[PDB]
Scaffold this active site. Structure first.
Site, PDB file in Angstrom:
ATOM      1  CG  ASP A  21     -18.329   1.509  -6.758  1.00 14.82           C
ATOM      2  OD1 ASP A  21     -18.354   1.228  -7.999  1.00 14.82           O
ATOM      3  OD2 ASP A  21     -17.353   1.275  -5.993  1.00 14.82           O
ATOM      4  CG  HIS A  52     -10.580   8.034  -2.873  1.00 19.58           C
ATOM      5  ND1 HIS A  52      -9.225   8.233  -3.035  1.00 19.58           N
ATOM      6  CD2 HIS A  52     -10.955   7.175  -3.862  1.00 19.58           C
ATOM      7  CE1 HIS A  52      -8.797   7.523  -4.068  1.00 19.58           C
ATOM      8  NE2 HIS A  52      -9.832   6.887  -4.605  1.00 19.58           N
ATOM      9  CG  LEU A  82     -11.680  -7.423   0.604  1.00 21.21           C
ATOM     10  CD1 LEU A  82     -12.709  -7.807   1.700  1.00 21.21           C
ATOM     11  CD2 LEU A  82     -10.243  -7.558   1.074  1.00 21.21           C
ATOM     12  CG  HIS A  83     -11.481  -4.036  -1.968  1.00 26.82           C
ATOM     13  ND1 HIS A  83     -10.341  -4.727  -1.612  1.00 26.82           N
ATOM     14  CD2 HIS A  83     -11.845  -3.334  -0.870  1.00 26.82           C
ATOM     15  CE1 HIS A  83     -10.009  -4.436  -0.363  1.00 26.82           C
ATOM     16  NE2 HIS A  83     -10.904  -3.588   0.108  1.00 26.82           N
ATOM     17  CB  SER A 121      -8.965  -6.044 -12.817  1.00 27.14           C
ATOM     18  OG  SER A 121      -9.254  -4.677 -12.685  1.00 27.14           O
ATOM     19  N   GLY A 127     -19.935   3.323  -0.723  1.00 29.96           N
ATOM     20  CA  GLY A 127     -19.829   4.192  -1.837  1.00 29.96           C
ATOM     21  C   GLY A 127     -19.288   5.583  -1.483  1.00 29.96           C
ATOM     22  CB  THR A 134     -15.468   7.904   6.433  1.00 33.08           C
ATOM     23  OG1 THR A 134     -16.263   6.967   7.138  1.00 33.08           O
ATOM     24  CG2 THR A 134     -15.159   7.340   5.078  1.00 33.08           C
ATOM     25  NE  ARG A 170      -3.107  -0.896  -0.190  1.00 36.45           N
ATOM     26  CZ  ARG A 170      -4.044  -1.659   0.359  1.00 36.45           C
ATOM     27  NH1 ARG A 170      -5.132  -1.112   0.880  1.00 36.45           N
ATOM     28  NH2 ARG A 170      -3.865  -2.981   0.373  1.00 36.45           N
TER      29      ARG A 170
END
Lengths: 435, 440
Positions: B383, B326, B279-280, B250, B323, B375, B49
């Protein structure tokens, strides 16, 4: 009185690994390296950036499994009921638990592998749909992915499962995949015998490699030397750190919580890449071309002259050279030790050429000065040994490697889930961003 | 037109920009020794990460403007990229052109590219047979991954590499395979969606003058003028989700497998296997479920306070608002806003209470989440809206939303694979370590 089975032995060592992980995690902020532009444009080469438990490359002694050399493993690991070579199932036990199993533990694990080897009908039908010319590694990848219909992890995750328990279904799926993959590989090798090889019952008293040989059409007492070769081959190639594409792709896909069938399928898709997967094949072609040129009664001098000419022509000696390893690959040496007890192998001119080259090529390559650490790797010998036993379609050498290389990545997937490792997600940048 | 100045096709337009990229690469390589970050224990145990360790050309996340494609915002793309023959939304084919070449195509170039895609949309018989072998309960993303890998029988790269091919030319067969994969993937996805109609959907002739999204919709059973609004949604969806840097599983798995010189069929299959990870992958589905549960509780005639109360109760319970949030982006995802702009011209969408709830949440949830304080950057991402919009058009099997994402996410990774080969990037091979080696 009964000895722990593999799942019990794994469960016993999980708490110590979680404790060691907790200690490492307290040092999260500690700096261990630098990232340079070279690393971003150079495929992360040399960037120490992922976890892999079971194997670490020692620059002098080669690959070590929980600190043990290849020689230590050959001495310590249980063998088959016949034969001289360590069992890949025993190597899997060691990779997973950090411990050497008893012979009896290995025998019980072999029986589990035999019993779980059968395939669902839809897998047999899937395989029968493949055109004859579909590349064997494409076939193998697809079939392994299709076995995700049988995934306990996928189903348990969907139902709801504690994080602390993710390892159990992962382990069950890994054993399931291990049991099945030799049979899938044999179906790739024998496309006209899907119905028979696909359903044939395995001898539950025999080891994983023996039963694989049987499914390949090389069973029985007449093929006992090949059984030992296959055992050794499969044990030696099981794991080699996390950086290679098959191991890494398995971990990467696994880290999104795709089950072991989908994750090792991705591993196999990476193994299908021609860039490094064809080394064993290339060595075989090169050795056979050398035999063609210098004949079957050749001197040390003939070999030396041939190597110099190859190099002066701007061609490589395949199966030699390494970025970090400063001595012959101990996997190579283990194959040479196998050969040393088999008079018919030592009488084979193709093998004699591999042996002579290993005695002469390193000095020649050093003097020529172009090749870093010019010592033989395992690919210098593996193809020729298979070729000697009649396994002479080099294209399928990758398939057998794919069977072997299930071992280490599946172990790491189990540990990834036991420890709760997160999704692998590096950060990218564009070239303009580096300028 | 076949003149002195006739408009270049995609392969020609790519060829024209390869030399400048190779020159820029050469300049970057002179700076190889420059240090750009640190590696910490956190990075090794935390899935790399925040470790800036791979190249991705086509898209870069801007902390203020969101994802940008060669410096262009989503708004710039919506204005500049060519649309279908009918419809208001940018074409995914045009997005692919931009990602690949760095340039906005003309409408005529897009029309010619759409025709190439339609002409290559047919599948070999063995792919249809393979799909018919799948048990009905096989997970749709497993189906999609497998079928895409099986298309490697058609790979020009694999065959050309085996025959012998110059390194400088690796990009060409890679490009040909990538276009082939793009043309075929909507048909494969439709076969996943319609397992009882494999023979018909599998061989149905497509209108070669229609765009990629339209033909996909037709294969899904949602063709014709009555579904024109859905066509524009699908165009926008597919264009918006095409690429989002190289780090996501991906994109990364595609690049990784591709770096061993596996062809694009095998490489994007690996991408899809990673996309299959729950998971995501399932965020769009989670948001839809959450919105529908919220509507169940608060109804359709509710006050701003009722919304606020619902959000506070969710949060006090220890649950998340899906949704939203970030690590880096400090404003609403511009992809989210582009979905809202789509909705704004469709009175039936704006009349849908489920959509109204998405809109209201986007006006109320950020302030609530900030005050709650747990958050980071609590703004809607794409999403937040995509599942509801599909749901409005009758595409109400959320399990298949991942399949449509898999079709979209072919675009960016295939572009990067083409560039990886054009630049001669090596195998991706980081170095591992064991926990004992970090304890020291």
């Amino acid at each position: 009185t009964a000895e722990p089975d593999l799942k019990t032995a794994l469960k016993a060592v999980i708490p110590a690994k979680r404790e060691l992980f907790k200690q490492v995690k307290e040092r999260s902020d500690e700096v261990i390296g630098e990232v340079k532009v070279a690393n971003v444009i150079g495929g992360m080469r040399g960037l120490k950036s992922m976890l892999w438990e079971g194997s670490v490359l020692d620059p002098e002694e080669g690959i070590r499994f929980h600190g043990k050399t290849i020689k230590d493993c050959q001495k310590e690991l249980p063998k088959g009921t016949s034969g001289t070579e360590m069992l890949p199932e025993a190597m899997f036990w060691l990779l997973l638990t950090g411990q050497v199993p008893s012979t009896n533990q290995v025998r019980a694990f072999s029986r589990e592998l035999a019993e779980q080897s059968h395939l669902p009908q839809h897998i047999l039908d899937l395989i029968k749909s493949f055109p004859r010319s579909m590349h064997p590694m494409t076939q193998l990848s697809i079939a392994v992915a299709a076995l995700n219909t049988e995934s306990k992890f996928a189903k348990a995750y969907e139902k709801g499962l504690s994080k602390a328990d993710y390892w159990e279904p992962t382990f069950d799926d890994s054993i399931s995949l291990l049991a099945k993959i030799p049979r899938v590989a044999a179906l790739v090798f024998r496309p006209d015998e899907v119905d028979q090889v696909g359903t044939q019952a395995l001898d539950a008293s025999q080891d994983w490699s023996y039963n694989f040989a049987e499914l390949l059409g090389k069973g029985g007492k007449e093929n006992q030397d090949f059984h030992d070769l296959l055992r050794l081959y499969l044990a030696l190639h099981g794991d080699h750190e996390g950086g290679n594409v098959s191991a890494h792709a398995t971990h990467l896909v696994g880290s999104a919580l795709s089950d072991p069938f989908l994750s090792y399928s991705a591993g196999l898709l990476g193994l299908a890449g021609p860039l490094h997967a064809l080394a064993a094949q290339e060595v075989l072609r090169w050795i056979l071309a050398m035999q063609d040129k210098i004949g079957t009664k050749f001197t040390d001098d003939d070999v030396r002259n041939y190597l110099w000419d190859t190099l002066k022509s701007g061609r490589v000696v395949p199966g030699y050279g390494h970025g970090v390893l400063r001595k012959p690959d101990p996997r190579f040496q283990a194959l040479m030790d196998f050969a040393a007890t088999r008079p018919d192998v030592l009488a084979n001119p193709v093998f004699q050429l591999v042996k002579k080259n290993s005695e002469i090529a390193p000095a020649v390559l050093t003097e020529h000065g172009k090749t870093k650490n010019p010592h033989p790797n395992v690919d210098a010998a593996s193809g020729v040994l298979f070729y000697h036993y009649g396994f002479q379609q080099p294209l399928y050498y990758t398939v057998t490697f794919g069977v072997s290389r299930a071992l280490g990545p599946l172990v790491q997937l189990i540990w990834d889930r036991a420890l709760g490792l997160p999704i692998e997600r590096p950060k990218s940048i564009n070239l303009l961003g580096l300028k």
